[PDB]
Amino acid sequence: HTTASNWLHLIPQTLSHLKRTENIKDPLFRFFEREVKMGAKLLQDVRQDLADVVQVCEGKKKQTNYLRTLINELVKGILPRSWSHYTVPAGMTVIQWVSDFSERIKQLQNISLAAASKELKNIHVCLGGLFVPEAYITATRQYVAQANSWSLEELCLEVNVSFGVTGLKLQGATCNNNKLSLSNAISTALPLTQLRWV
Amino acid sequence: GSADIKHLLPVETQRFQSISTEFLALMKKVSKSPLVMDVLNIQGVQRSLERLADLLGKIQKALGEYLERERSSFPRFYFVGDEDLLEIIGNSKNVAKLQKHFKKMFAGVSSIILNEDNSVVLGISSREGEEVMFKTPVSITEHPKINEWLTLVEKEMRVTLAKLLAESVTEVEIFGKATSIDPNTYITWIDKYQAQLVVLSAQIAWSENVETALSSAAPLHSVLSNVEVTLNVLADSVLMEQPPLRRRKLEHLITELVHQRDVTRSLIKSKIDNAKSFEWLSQMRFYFDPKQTDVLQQLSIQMANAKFNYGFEYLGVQDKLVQTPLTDRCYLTMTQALEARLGGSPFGPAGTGKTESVKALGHQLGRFVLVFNCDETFDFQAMGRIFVGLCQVGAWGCFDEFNRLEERMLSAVSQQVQCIQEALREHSNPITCELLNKQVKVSPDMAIFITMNPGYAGRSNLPDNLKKLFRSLAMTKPDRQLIAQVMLYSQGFRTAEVLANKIVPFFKLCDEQLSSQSHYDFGLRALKSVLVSAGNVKRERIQKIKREAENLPEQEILIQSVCETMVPKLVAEDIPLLFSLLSDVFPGVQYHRGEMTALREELKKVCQEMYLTYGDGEEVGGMWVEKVLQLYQITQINHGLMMVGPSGSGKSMAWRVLLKALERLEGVEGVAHIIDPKAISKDHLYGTLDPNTREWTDGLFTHVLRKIIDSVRGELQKRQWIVFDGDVDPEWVENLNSVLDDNKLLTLPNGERLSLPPNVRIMFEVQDLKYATLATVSRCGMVWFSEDVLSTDMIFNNFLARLRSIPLDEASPMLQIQRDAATIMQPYFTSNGLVTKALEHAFQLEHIMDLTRLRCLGSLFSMLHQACRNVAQYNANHPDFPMQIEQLERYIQRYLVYAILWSLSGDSRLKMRAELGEYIRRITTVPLPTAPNIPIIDYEVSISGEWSPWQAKVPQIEVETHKVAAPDVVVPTLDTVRHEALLYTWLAEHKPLVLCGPPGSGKTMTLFSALRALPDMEVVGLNFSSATTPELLLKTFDHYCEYRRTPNGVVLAPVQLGKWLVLFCDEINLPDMDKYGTQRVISFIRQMVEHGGFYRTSDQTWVKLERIQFVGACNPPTDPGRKPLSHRFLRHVPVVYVDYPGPASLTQIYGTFNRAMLRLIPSLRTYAEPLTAAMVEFYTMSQERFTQDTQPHYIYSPREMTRWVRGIFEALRPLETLPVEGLIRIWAHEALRLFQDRLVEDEERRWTDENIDTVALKHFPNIDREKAMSRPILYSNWLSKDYIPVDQEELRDYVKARLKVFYEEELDVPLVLFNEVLDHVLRIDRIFRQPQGHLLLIGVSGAGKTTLSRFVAWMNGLSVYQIKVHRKYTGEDFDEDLRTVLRRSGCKNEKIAFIMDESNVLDSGFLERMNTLLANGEVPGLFEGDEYATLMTQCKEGAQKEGLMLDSHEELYKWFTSQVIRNLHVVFTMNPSSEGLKDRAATSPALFNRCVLNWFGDWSTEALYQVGKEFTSKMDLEKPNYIVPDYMPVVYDKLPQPPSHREAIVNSCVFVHQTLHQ
Amino acid sequence: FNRYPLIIDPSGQATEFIMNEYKDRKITRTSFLDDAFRKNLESALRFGNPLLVQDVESYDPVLNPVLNREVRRTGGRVLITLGDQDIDLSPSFVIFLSTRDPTVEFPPDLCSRVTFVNFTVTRSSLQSQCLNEVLKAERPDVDEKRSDLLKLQGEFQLRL
C-alpha cells in the first residue's frame, strides 16, 4: 500500500478541473456542450474515486466493498469497468489510459475555453480525442446543411490535406499534395485534414 | 374416459379391468388397516404388487406400441400429444373436436369447411379467412380410415393447388403479352386467385417471358417495358381504396414486380447474350411444363446449380419480404447449402432479418416452416422428438438463437445433425435413418436452419464438428434505403423514393446524434414499425378525408408516424435533438397532436375516482397524462411494451388508469395479470419437463397463456394485459423473443406451439435495461417514464385525498378528524412549502442506504396516520372533552416537523440528525423547543401539543439481581426509547421496516422490546445466508400459517386467529447478488409487499396474505459480506439506523448492571463505577485497533460486554466473599477469554495482555498487582464446586489422572498435556457450561481439537455425536442425521455434543441448515408427514415423563425448541484460510455471531519444545561432558542458560520443525 | 512406517514392489471407487491381513477412524468402531494407499493422517536404467554375464 499510494498520488497530477459550459440551434455548440458535460462528469467521478482511495490508503477512512474492489484492481493494474465509458482498445493498461484521459480532458478544456470566447468553426480538432467522433461528424454535416440550406441525403465529403481535423494517421502510405504514395513506413502522421461538404 | 378404447382394444380393456379389480381389492384391504406393519403383514402382498406392476407395464407397452403404430399410419400425427390423440381416437365418430388441431398440422390452414352432415369436406380455409375449393371433394364415408382420408385430403389439396396454378399461368400469359392491361380484368383475376398462386404465377410468367426474349437487346427492352406497364397499373389500382385482402395481395405482387424490374434492369445494364451466363443463372428461375402428367412436380424452382420442386402447401397470405440484394445473396448461399445437403446457418446482430429471411425463402419454395426458440431448457429427447417431427413431415426447422443451447448438448445433437445430413446425402444418390435408437423415415424435403447471434449475452459457442455441417453466412447491413423505398411504394405514396431517401439517413443520424442509452433502438425493426404505422395513419387520414383520390401530405404523415413511434422512447433531453433533426431533414415539417377528447375525459373521470391528480397538458399532471396517452398509442400500434424509468415514476398507476379508462370506453373488461419473473425460478415461470417420462407441466406464464387461449370463461372477448413487474435479463426474456417478434407464437421443448391471440398485450414494468440484450430491446416499444414525470406535489395531493376519504379503520369521527388534519396540514404540503425543501436538503445529505423520495414519503405518511390514530385514541379517552381545534393545530404542526425529521433523517448518524434539525429550525416558522444545545431529535411531541424531552422520559431504573444479563432485559436510554417509539409507530400500521446498523448494535433487542409491548403480534424468527432461496419463506408459511379457500381467491392466515404474524429477517441484504443484479428473496418480498401476496407454484394460483407483516435487520451495505438492496424494494420499506451506544451511554448502560450485580458482596459496592469505567476503554481500544480489515472475525460489539457481565455474575454468585484482587482477577480472566481467543498472532495477544495490565493499574491503584494478575490466571470448577482459581500444577495432575481414567472407557489414544492444552480444555469446558453454547475452533488438523472436544464432552456428561460422513452422503441422509440428533436432544432430554468438520460439509444446504439450527435453535421445514406426528407423540411422552402436562401443538413445539436450546451443543472444526474465513462469514452469519470463536492455530514453539521435552524425558540423553556452543542457534525463546544436552536436542527438534515450515 | 503410508508412484513400480514384499501375507488389491471396497475393508479388519487400496484421489472419509488409529479397549479385546459396526481390530492389519498422479494436492485432514512416500525418478536411476537397456540391446553376452557376476557377488557377500 505504500508504493500503491505513491503511484496513487503520482497519477492524478494532470487532472485538475473541467467546466460544464445550454439551448442553441447550433449543432456543433450543443454537441460540444453535452460532450464537455460528460467529460466533466467523468472527471469528477474519477477525482472522487482517487480521493477516496488515497484516503483509505493513508488516512482515517475504512474500506467499503466498492473501494476494496477499486484498490484491488488498481494494485493489479487493470482498468476498472466503471471508468471505461468511452472506447478503449482491447483493455489498455491504466498507465496509458490515464494519459489518454488527460489528453481528452485538456482537449475539452481548450474546447470550453474557445467556446467561452462563429469562432467555433475556426478551431482545430483531433478526432481521436473525442468520445463520439461519428456524432462530431454528423454535427458538422448538420451545421453545413443548416448554413447552406442543402439536402442531407446527397452530401458527400471532399478531403484535402472547411473543417480542421488533426491526429489522423495513415497505414503504409505517404501523402504529397493529396496524392497517395506507397511506402515501407509503418504509419505516417497527417498534419492537418480539411473536410469540405460538396 | 372414452368408450372407443373398449371397442378398439378389447384384450387390453379386459386386462385393465382385471388389473383395476385386483387393485380395488388391494386398496380396500390396505384402507381397512392403514398401519404400515399391518400392510406388510398381508400374505403375498409383495408378490401381488409385483404381478400388478408387471401387468401394468405390459399393457402400457402394448398401448404405446399401438399408438406408435397409429403414428406410423399417419405421419402428421407425430405432432399431436398423447392425451389429445387419445381424445381424437375416442372422438372419431364426432368431428366437432377435430377442427382445433389444424394449426399444428398446416402452415396456414386454420380450419376446414365441411358439409352440413359432415360426410364430406369441400375445402380448406385460411387463418385470415381466405378459402381454397377442392377440385374433387373428399368424402370420409367411402374412406372411414383416418389416415386414408387424410392422405386423400393432402393429395387433393396438392392437385387443387397445381391445377389452380396452371390455370393462373394460362390467364397471366394474356396479361404478359398485352401492351395495355384493363384494371377490371386484372382485379377480377386477382380476386379469383389466391395470394401465393398469383405471386408464383407472376414469377412463372416473368421467367418464361425473359427466357423467350433471350432466345429471340430489343426483346429485353420489351420485357422491361411490359414490367413497367404492369407496375403502373398496380400503382393506379393500389392508390384508391380496396378490400383489405386485395390490398395485401396488391402489396405483395407490387413488391415482387419491383424486384423483377430491378433484376431486369441489372441484366440489361450489362450485355447478356446467352442463357448460360451466371449473371442470369444467379437469380430466381421458375419453369412450368404443361406436358408433365405429374402435377406435383410440374413446377421447378431453380437457382445457380440448385433444382427444386414446389412444396405446394397452402400458406395463407403471410407477409412478402422485400427482395434486398443482401436477401438475394442469402438466397444464393442458402440454396447452395441445400444443394450441398448442408443445413443453412445465417448469423449476425439482432434485427438484420435472418429468421424472417429464412421463413420467406421457405415460403418461396412452398415448404412448411417451423420457427423454434431454442433455449437452455431443451433436452436431448425433446430435441430428437422435434427432429423426427421435421424428418417425417418435410417441415423446415428454423431454430432461433441456437448458441444458447448448453454446449455439451450442442455437441450431443451434432451427432443427430450428422445422421440427418448423411441420410439426405444418401437420399440425393426405403430411405431411413436412426433417431433416438429408432429407425425413422426421412422426408426428401428436409432442411435445418440455424439463426445465431455471436456474442449476444456471452452465450456458448459452437463445436467445430457441428460447425462443419452448417454453411455459415453473415448478414450485417441490410439495404435500409431500398427496403424503405419498396415498402412505401407498396403502401402507396407519390414521393416514395424521396420519403425513403429522407427517412433512412434520418435514422442514421438519429442513431448517432442522440445520447447513448441502454433502451434506445433504431434498427430495422423500428424502421419497419414506423413504416407500417405510416401506412395505417395514411389509410386513416384517407378515410377522414373521404367521409366528407387527390393528394395527401405524405411528409406530414411520415413525420406524425415517426413521432408517435419514437418520442415515447426518448429521454427528456433528446426530444429537442430529435425535433431539430426532423426540422432540418423536413423543412416544412409541422406537427399534430390532441384529438383525444373522449379518452382524455374518461381518464380525467377515473383519475378523480381513484384519487389521482389530473393534468390537461400544462397543469401539474400534464407530463404524466401525456405519457399515459403515449402508452395508449404504443399499445394500439405495437405488440410488446415496457415502461422504463426510475423507481417511482407513476408507471404502475399509469397503466392501471389506462386499462380502466379503456374498459370504460370500449365496454370490454380488462383483466391484468401481474407476474414477477425473478421472484420464482425460470423453471417455475415457463414449465418443467420430466427426464423420466416425457410429460410437460405448465409454468406460470405458460399456464396463463394456455388459459387465455382456451378461453373457457370467455377470456378471448375480454382485454388481456400480461405484465412482467420485475427486472429483465437475457436468461428468461430470450424465451419471448419469438413471442414479441412478428411470428406471434410461443414455442415449448415438447413441441407444443402456442399462438398469441390479438387480445393479449405483453408489457414490462422495469427499472433499467442495462442488463438486457439488444435482441429484446429491439422488439418492444419503449415508454420512458422519467423521474420528474411524477412530482412531489402530486404525491402530496394523492396523500391528502387518501386522508380526506378512505378512513384508516376500514361521517365517522375518524373521517372528521382526518379532514381536520388535512385542512391544518394543507399549507405545508403544497408548492415549495416545507416538506419539499426538507426533502431537497435530505437528498443533499447522504444516508446509510440510497435515499429515494417515496421511501421517506411513505415513512411520513405512516407517521401522520399514526398521529391521527393518536388523536382518535385521546378523543376516546376523553369523551367529555374532545380535541379542540387550536390544540389539534398546535399538536399536528409539531408532529409534522418531528415526523419529517425522523423520516428523512431516520437512517443517518447523530451529527446529521442534528444537522437536519438545525436546518429545519433555520428554515421554518414552527413553534420549537428553546434549547441551543439539545437537538430537535431529542424531543417528543406530547398529546397536549407541547414538546416533551425524552431525557425526562428515560428513568434511572435499577434492575434486580436475579436478572442482570438476561436476553430480554433492556435498560432505557435515549436511543433505545426513541427507536422504541419509532418501531411502535411503524408496527401499529403493519408496515415493513429494516433495522440497519453495525452488528451487535441492539437492533433485534429494540425490535423485541417493541413486540413485547403489543400483545397482538407474535414473532417468527428467520435467518438469511448467502444461499438463501424463497423456499425458506415458503416453508415458514407452511409451518406457521395455513392456506384457506375463499370466494375471492385463496388466502394465507396465521394458525392463531386474531393475531398478526410478523416475520423477522436478520440478514435481509445478505442473499447473494446473481450475475444480473437481483436477489430472488428480495424480489419475492417486494412482490408480496406490493401486491399483497405471491403465486403458489403448486397450481399457479394467486394467494393473498391476510395478516402477515415483515421486519428486517441488516448490516450496512458497505460491509464486506453485504450487498445493496434495490430501489424498487426500498421504496415501500423505511429504514432506521441504530449505531453503537458509545461511551457516554455505555457507561450508565453497564453501570446499572454492575451496581445490580455487586449486591451479593456488600463490601465491593464502592468499586462498581471504577469497574465499569475500566471496562469501557478496554472495549474502546479493542474497537480502535482490531478492525475488520485485519481479519473478517474482528468484530467487537456490546454483546461481548453483555457476555462479560454475565460471566462475572456467574463467577461470583456462589463465591459470596471476594476481595478487590480477586474481583480484578475475574475481570482480567473474562477479558482474556473474550478478547484473546479470537486473535491469531502472538503480538496482538501480547498487546491485549499489556492493555489489561495497564487498564487495571490505571483504574485500580494501590492493589496487590502480583496477587490479582498472574501468569496462568486459570479458573475451574472441577477441583471444587465453586468457580475458584486453580493452580497450574495441581490442575495438570488432576487432568493427567482424568486422561488416565479416560483412555479406558472411550478411546485408548494417549495424549500429552501442556499449558496450551490446559487452556484449551478449560476454554471448551467453560463454553460447554453455559446453555446454548456453540464452539468454533480454528486450527491446523492434528492439533487435537476434536479429541479435546471429546474429552470435555465426556467429562461434562455430553453424548458425543459424529455425523459419520461417507461416500454418496446426500441431503436426505444429512436430514435423517439431523432429525435423529434433534429427536435425541429435545425428546430424550439429554446432553449432546455435535462434532463435525469443515470437510464433512458437501453442499450449501448443509451450511444453511447448520446456520438456521445455530441461530434459531430450531429447523423449520424439517419434520413432515407422519414423521411429524411421531415427533409430536415423542414430545408429549417426554412432557409426561418430565411431569409438565402440555397440549395442542405449538406450545409443545416451543417446549421442544427450548429443550433443544438448553441441551444441544454444537462444535465446529475448521482450517485457517484467508478465503475460507470470509467465505464462511458470508455464507453463515450464525457461525460468527451465535458461536464463540477459538483460534487454536498451529502449535507454538513453546508447545513444541514442551511436548518434545516431556516425551524424550524417558530415555538417557544427558551428556556429562557437553560444550555449549558460542553461536547457540536459538529458535525457542527463554531457553535455560546454560542448556543441557537434552535441552539442546529438543531445541534442535523444534528448529527442524520450523525449518520444515520455511 | 508409523502412520499408514500413502505412496505416490506414477510408474507402477512401487505397487509391484509392495506385492512382492508382502507376498507371504495375503494382500487384497482394491480401489476406492470399487463397490466391494467397504466389504473388502471389513474382511481385512476381521482377518488381520494386509490391504492395499489404489486411487486415493477419490478418498472417502470412512477411513478416518482407521488412519487416526482410534481404538476401544474392551479388556484384552481390541475394538474399533468403523461407521456403524464394531470390529475386532487384529494387530496385524496394515493398509497402503496408492497414487498414479504426482500432480495431486491433498486436503490437510488427509495430509496429516498418512505418511507420504514419493516415488520420483532421479538422474542416477535413469542413467543406470538407460545404460542397462543399451547393454541389453547392444552387448547381450556382456550384459548377461554382468548380471550373473553381480548376482554372484551379492550372494558371496551374503556368504561373508
Ligand SMILES: Nc1ncnc2c1ncn2[C@@H]1O[C@H](COP(=O)(O)OP(=O)(O)OP(=O)(O)O)[C@@H](O)[C@H]1O
Ligand atoms: N398522477 C399521479 N398523481 C398523484 N400521485 C401519483 C400519480 N402517479 C403516481 N402517483 C403516486 O405514486 C406512488 C408510487 O406508486 P406508483 O405505482 O406510481 O409507482 P411506480 O412508478 O410504478 O414505481 P416502481 O417503479 O417502483 O414500480 C403512488 O402511491 C401514487 O400515489
Ligand SMILES: Nc1ncnc2c1ncn2[C@@H]1O[C@H](COP(=O)(O)OP(=O)(O)O)[C@@H](O)[C@H]1O
Ligand atoms: N429484407 C427485409 N424485408 C422485410 N422485412 C424485414 C427484412 N429484414 C428484416 N425485416 C423485419 O425484421 C424482422 C426480422 O427479424 P430478424 O432480424 O430475422 O430476427 P433475428 O434478429 O433473430 O435475426 C421482421 O419483423 C421482418 O419483418
Ligand SMILES: Nc1ncnc2c1ncn2[C@@H]1O[C@H](COP(=O)(O)OP(=O)(O)O)[C@@H](O)[C@H]1O
Ligand atoms: N441500551 C442497552 N441496554 C442494555 N443492553 C444493551 C443495550 N444495548 C445493547 N445491549 C446489549 O447488546 C446486545 C445486543 O445484541 P443483539 O441485539 O442480539 O445484536 P443484533 O441486533 O446484531 O442481533 C444485547 O445482548 C444487549 O444485552
Ligand SMILES: Nc1ncnc2c1ncn2[C@@H]1O[C@H](COP(=O)(O)OP(=O)(O)O)[C@@H](O)[C@H]1O
Ligand atoms: N496433545 C496431543 N498429544 C498427543 N497426541 C495428539 C495430541 N493432539 C492430537 N494428537 C493426535 O492427533 C490425532 C487426531 O488429532 P485431532 O486434531 O484431534 O483430529 P483432527 O486433526 O481431525 O482435528 C490423534 O490420533 C492424536 O493421537
Ligand SMILES: [Mg+2]
Ligand atoms: Mg431470430
Ligand SMILES: [Mg+2]
Ligand atoms: Mg410500480
